[PDB]
Amino acid sequence: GRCTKSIPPICFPD
């Protein structure tokens, strides 16, 4: 449930 800001940024199942 958290994403990075990773270009494009990548999101995780967390």
Side-chain angles (χ1 to χ4, degrees):
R2 294 188 187 220
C3 291
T4 68
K5 183 183 183 228
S6 21
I7 173 182
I10 308 311
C11 283
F12 307 135
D14 59 7

